[PDB]
Structure 1
Amino acid sequence: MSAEHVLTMLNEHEVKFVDLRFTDTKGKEQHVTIPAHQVNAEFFEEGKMFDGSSIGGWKGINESDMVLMPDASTAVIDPFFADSTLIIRCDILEPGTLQGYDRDPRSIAKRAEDYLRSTGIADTVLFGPEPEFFLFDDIRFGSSISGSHVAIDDAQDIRSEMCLVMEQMGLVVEAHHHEVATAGQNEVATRFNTMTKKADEIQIYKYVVHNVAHRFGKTATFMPKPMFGDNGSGMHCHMSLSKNGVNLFAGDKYAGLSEQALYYIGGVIKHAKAINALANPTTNSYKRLVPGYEAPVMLAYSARNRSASIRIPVVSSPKARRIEVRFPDPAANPYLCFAALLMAGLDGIKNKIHPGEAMDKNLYDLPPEEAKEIPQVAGSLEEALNELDLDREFLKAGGVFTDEAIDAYIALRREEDDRVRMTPHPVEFELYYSV
């Protein structure tokens, strides 16, 4: 899809505004709105000058402005704006060299895919994530200097009309798994795409979910553990690799899974805590990664066991042979999370890392001399951030991740880890006020 069709869309729909959208390192979606008459054919080869004071690494204290370069293939009319608006996802570029910014998640995902095609291991990667959310009727939260409080108060029309709006915005939905045990938790299934296209689709997914919940007087949250004792929100990711139109993950070994797939799983397992720094970036994210029942915390693979973090779905077709990693949560930044998973898999393929043996029939039942032995995902955000700081190397292959970008990301996550670490919590008043 080119720019000429975008101008044709502008004239066709009588678009008044164009909303240029990009993503922080935090994963939040930033936008600049320009009038539709400011969009010309030349606008797609210079972009728009932008002031980079966005939170995170973009708050670099030496530098000048950045460039918003739109991707014309991502244009879609916004369903929620009263004045007809055309949404375009943009990359952040350095104004001089006109190259992708080092601290841009979308540019990093594009670099990861380019490095994939460069190494010759595969031609493309297919990602299907399963982001789950919570729908609440109401919620009030706050934390002043004299205390804290939170209070959450828990239809088919909302779910169906979410699916309708998602299909308006170019997503191909194919199910909707409302859950009656742990009521409130929903998940819409969508079709697989490549890495950066699927990350853009996740951003659209969250936008639609939030706004449709708003219009029905509800509140949706992609927060990994919004509520005590009830099951948390996860985002399982199915990965496949394709070269010239055939799976590299289809083979003859365990559960019909190929040798390259086994090294992919080995690479994911080895770096899973550095990955956890990016796939599980919040402190809330580790209140659902606690050892127990149905918790994706054991770093091993099994088609049968459902305590293993890496699952191998059984499909009656060799053309659909993928691996599902289950520890990521929907609070991740899709670009950074997906790039981290891809680079871990590529480092596993490159170094012939063997995962080991399938943990078919060994759940959290605490085997006498195996519960401690099996690798686990990070236990807290500090541990994941420290392991990322130590294990930068697999992210730097091919120049996808800069040391400066990783440093800025880690500092930005730490300034929230510390705010959580130093406030006193009401459960500690319940337990330790008298003590």
Structure 2
Amino acid sequence: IQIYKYVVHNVAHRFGKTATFMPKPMFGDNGSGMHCHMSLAKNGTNLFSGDKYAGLSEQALYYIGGVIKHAKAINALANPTTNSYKRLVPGYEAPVMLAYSARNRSASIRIPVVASPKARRIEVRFPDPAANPYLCFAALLMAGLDGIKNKIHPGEPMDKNLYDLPPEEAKEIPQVAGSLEEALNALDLDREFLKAGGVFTDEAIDAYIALRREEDDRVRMTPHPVEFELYYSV
């Protein structure tokens, strides 16, 4: 990913352009996401293929359950910028509903329908390119493992619709964090699954949170152009 970004940034520069991996540079058009396809393996066999839903193993489902359980904390690493949340907004294709499906592209977790069981895997859609590769991937794993170790069942797949109509039962099903602060706070509280195996230390986590809170503050404290449009004549 690091090399990828490096190549993109530099080839662009050499061509007289400038590239950005910001998640939402423009209001009104697509943001940039970084979907993450994942699967586990042992001695060459795909631990995610099985007889359960869409060709999945029950291990895959526990993994999904883990990701869903710790989504808000993962957000702090997979969507580490205030800008990230301008992409994750109640929109139609917004990968914000904490659920899985092989079709419903409202679900932040898609299940690719593929023939070869060797290629069975899950696609977590909410990450964006601003995410630290390392920390984002790691947090995704640890959440998955904790989903397994604790056999966290996913529940049933959402094949209905996204955030708008639905709007039936006010459609308050699982959702990803709605702001960076919220995500940072989740990471704060829900840190155990990351400390497992001594992978993440409290100090590391607290330091990361502090770095991002400083960023969150700049945006929270600086008047926004739109605020003038909305309130100058108040």
Does structure 1 conserve the Cα–Cα contact (< 8 Å) formed by 2:163 and 2:171?
Answer: no
Which secondary structure does the structure 1 equivalent of 2:213 belong to?
A: helix
Cα displacement string for residues 103-147 of structure 1 (whole angstroms, at most 9, x for unaligned residues): xxxxxxxxxxxxxxxxxxxxxxxxxxxxxxxxxxxxxxxxxxxxx
Does structure 1 conserve the Cα–Cα contact (< 8 Å) formed by 2:92 and 2:164?
Answer: no
Does structure 1 conserve the Cα–Cα contact (< 8 Å) formed by 2:77 and 2:136?
Answer: yes
The percentage of counterpart residues that share the same residue type is 97
Deviation for aligned residue 1:369: 4.2
Does structure 2 conserve the Cα–Cα contact (< 8 Å) formed by 1:304 and 1:361?
Answer: no
Closer, same or farther in 2 for the Cα pair 1:240/1:371, shift >3 Å? Answer: farther
Which secondary structure does the structure 2 equivalent of 1:313 belong to?
A: coil
Which secondary structure does the structure 2 equivalent of 1:417 belong to?
A: helix
Equivalent in the alignment of 2:181:
382
Cα separation, 2, equivalents of 1:428 and 1:267 = 39
In the alignment, structure 2 segments of 5+ residues that lack a partner are none
Deviation for aligned residue 1:422: 0.4
Cα displacement string for residues 324-380 of structure 1 (whole angstroms, at most 9, x for unaligned residues): 000000000000000000000000000000010000122223335444331100000
Cα separation, 1, equivalents of 2:97 and 2:137 = 20
Does structure 1 conserve the Cα–Cα contact (< 8 Å) formed by 2:56 and 2:120?
Answer: yes
Equivalent in the alignment of 1:316:
115
Aligned counterpart in structure 2 of residue 408 of structure 1, from 181, 188, 207: 207
Does structure 2 conserve the Cα–Cα contact (< 8 Å) formed by 1:281 and 1:332?
Answer: yes
Cα separation, 2, equivalents of 1:380 and 1:356 = 26
Which secondary structure does the structure 1 equivalent of 2:28 belong to?
A: coil
Cα displacement string for residues 183-238 of structure 1 (whole angstroms, at most 9, x for unaligned residues): xxxxxxxxxxxxxxxxxxx0000000000000111111000001111010000000
RMSD of aligned Cα (Å): 0.9
Task: Give the alignment's TM-score, normalised by structure 1.
Answer: 0.53
Which secondary structure does the structure 2 equivalent of 1:235 belong to?
A: coil
Cα separation, 1, equivalents of 2:161 and 2:206 = 38
Cα separation, 1, equivalents of 2:70 and 2:24 = 24
Cα displacement string for residues 61-105 of structure 1 (whole angstroms, at most 9, x for unaligned residues): xxxxxxxxxxxxxxxxxxxxxxxxxxxxxxxxxxxxxxxxxxxxx
As a proportion of its length, which structure holds more helix? 2
Task: Give the count of matched residue pairs.
Answer: 234
Deviation for aligned residue 1:407: 0.4
Cα separation, 2, equivalents of 1:334 and 1:215 = 25
Does structure 2 conserve the Cα–Cα contact (< 8 Å) formed by 1:313 and 1:324?
Answer: yes
Does structure 2 conserve the Cα–Cα contact (< 8 Å) formed by 1:312 and 1:323?
Answer: yes
Look at both structures and tell me which one has the larger radius of gyration over its CA atoms: 1
Cα displacement string for residues 232-283 of structure 1 (whole angstroms, at most 9, x for unaligned residues): 0000000010011111110011111110000000000000000001100000
Does structure 1 conserve the Cα–Cα contact (< 8 Å) formed by 2:102 and 2:111?
Answer: yes
Cα separation, 1, equivalents of 2:167 and 2:6 = 47
Does structure 2 conserve the Cα–Cα contact (< 8 Å) formed by 1:236 and 1:327?
Answer: yes
Cα separation, 1, equivalents of 2:171 and 2:204 = 34
Which secondary structure does the structure 1 equivalent of 2:99 belong to?
A: strand
Matched, 1:261 2:60: yes
Cα displacement string for residues 373-423 of structure 1 (whole angstroms, at most 9, x for unaligned residues): 311000000100111111110000000000000000000000110011100
Aligned counterpart in structure 1 of residue 46 of structure 2, from 237, 247, 255: 247
Cα displacement string for residues 28-57 of structure 1 (whole angstroms, at most 9, x for unaligned residues): xxxxxxxxxxxxxxxxxxxxxxxxxxxxxx
Does structure 1 conserve the Cα–Cα contact (< 8 Å) formed by 2:81 and 2:180?
Answer: yes
Q: Which runs of structure 2 are paired with 1:130-145 in the superposition (5 Å)?
A: none
| Greater RCO structure (CA 8 Å; 6+ sep) | 2
Deviation for aligned residue 1:317: 0.6
Does structure 2 conserve the Cα–Cα contact (< 8 Å) formed by 1:364 and 1:371?
Answer: no
In the alignment, structure 1 segments of 5+ residues that lack a partner are 1-201
Cα separation, 1, equivalents of 2:147 and 2:171 = 24
**Please, which moves more after superposition, 370-379 or 243-252?**
370-379
Closer, same or farther in 2 for the Cα pair 1:370/1:321, shift >3 Å? Answer: farther
Cα displacement string for residues 133-181 of structure 1 (whole angstroms, at most 9, x for unaligned residues): xxxxxxxxxxxxxxxxxxxxxxxxxxxxxxxxxxxxxxxxxxxxxxxxx
Does structure 1 conserve the Cα–Cα contact (< 8 Å) formed by 2:48 and 2:60?
Answer: yes
Cα separation, 2, equivalents of 1:236 and 1:373 = 24
Task: Give the alignment's TM-score, normalised by structure 2.
Answer: 0.98
Which secondary structure does the structure 1 equivalent of 2:38 belong to?
A: strand
Deviation for aligned residue 1:291: 1.2
Q: Which runs of structure 2 are paired with 1:21-420 in the superposition (5 Å)?
A: 202-420=1-219
Which secondary structure does the structure 1 equivalent of 2:30 belong to?
A: coil
Cα separation, 1, equivalents of 2:169 and 2:49 = 30
Closer, same or farther in 2 for the Cα pair 1:232/1:215, shift >3 Å? Answer: same
As a proportion of its length, which structure holds more strand? 1
